[PDB]
């Protein structure tokens, strides 16, 4: 599906915050005893609406809510951390969960370079045929 922003307004710029899971630490700052407190672990960035991505993202988060709320209603887990890992698993199962039939629409195997090896070795058998 396509994303149709149907919101009263859109802030076209995204002033965002996040963490860093392997920031190149200076000296001993990676040690919890010496490192920053909870308030000082964030990095910031600013992103503009190139390709309409910011206004599309605001609509995407809005449209995601019904499915996410229904998922949360049905889980017994108090805090859910596994959504992204499960989507990665489903990504793999969609492609590799069964037998990969080469040249099929659901098998992501490209034999082209090895077509240009098998067809490129016919002139080692049909060329070499002197008698």
């Amino acid at each position: 599906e396509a994303i149709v922003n149907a919101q009263p307004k859109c802030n076209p710029n995204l002033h965002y915050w996040t963490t860093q899971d392997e920031g190149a630490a200076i000296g001993l700052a990676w040690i919890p005893y010496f490192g920053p407190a909870a308030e000082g672990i964030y990095i910031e960035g600013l992103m503009h609406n190139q390709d309409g991505l910011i206004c599309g993202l605001r609509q995407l988060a809005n449209e995601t809510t019904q499915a996410l709320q229904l998922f949360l209603r049905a889980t017994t887990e108090l805090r859910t951390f596994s959504i992204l890992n499960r989507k990665a698993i489903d990504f793999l199962l969609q492609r590799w969960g069964g037998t990969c039939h080469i040249l099929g629409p659901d098998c992501c195997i490209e034999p082209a370079d090895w077509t240009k090896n098998i067809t490129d070795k016919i002139d080692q058998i049909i060329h070499d045929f002197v008698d």
Partner: protein, 250 residues
């Protein structure tokens, strides 16, 4: 199925669960992201009277928490200390590991009372209360949050921070007849209207201090602004006379 955002043809799209695109590439879980977007950025009214009407109490529904990795700097956040008239707490304490939203230009801290006819306070429009990288369906006591929603993305292969607390007192919280007062000091208050912006409240607070219009007795002084005075569209784009001491500003 929970939607997943993907970039095709220079545009964001929801990935179709039915159709498989073999040229889409996911070489690492680092390409997958969960992000929180503030209702602010969609143009909703952020004043305390308008914001609080979007929340309500409800029993029988267990609270739920989901994590998100990155968020948006917020202009308006909220922090609630609501009790019943009998003194009992309306909101539960923040669970272990749930801290306030990390980027708030203005924290609207509301203290007061209401009937609180329900075990937990939910968002009436189904949005989430965004905390520090955890999104909850309910409000926790004394914990700063932004209203927002969560999106999930599969990405392609690879001024400081100032915050100001604005304090309010409230009665009848969560009902039709909720009354709000902006707090200048513990004895000086301003009758709150939905049209007052954070910048107007802070400037009105400063003039009251420098014009010496605070309470100089032991009683409560409640100023009122008359409609004549304007106030200063989304965030990204005086004479005092006295008439519990009520009064007027014009």
């Amino acid at each position: 199925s929970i939607p997943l955002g993907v970039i095709h043809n220079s545009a964001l799209q929801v990935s179709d669960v039915d159709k498989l695109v073999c040229r889409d590439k996911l070489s690492s879980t680092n390409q997958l992201r969960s992000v929180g977007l503030n209702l602010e950025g969609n143009g909703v009214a952020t004043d305390v009277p308008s914001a609080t009407k979007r929340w309500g109490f409800r029993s029988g529904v267990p609270p739920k928490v989901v994590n998100y990795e990155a968020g948006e700097w917020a202009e308006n956040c909220y922090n609630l200390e609501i009790k019943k008239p009998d003194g009992s707490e309306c909101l539960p304490a923040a669970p272990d590991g749930i801290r306030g939203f990390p980027r708030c230009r203005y924290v609207h801290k509301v203290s007061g009372t209401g009937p609180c006819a329900g075990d937990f306070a939910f968002h009436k429009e189904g949005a989430f209360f965004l905390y520090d990288r955890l999104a909850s369906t309910v409000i926790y006591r004394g914990t700063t949050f932004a209203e927002g929603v969560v999106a999930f993305l599969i990405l392609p292969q690879a001024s400081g921070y100032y915050s100001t607390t604005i304090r309010y007192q409230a009665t009848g919280f969560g009902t039709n007849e909720t009354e709000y007062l902006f707090e200048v000091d513990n004895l000086t208050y301003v009758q709150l209207e939905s049209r007052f912006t954070p910048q107007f409240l802070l400037q009105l607070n400063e003039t009251i201090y420098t014009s010496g219009k605070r309470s100089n007795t032991t009683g409560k002084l409640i100023w009122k602004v008359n409609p004549e005075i304007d106030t200063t569209w989304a965030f990204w784009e005086l004479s005092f006379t006295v008439v519990x001491x009520x009064x007027x500003x014009x």
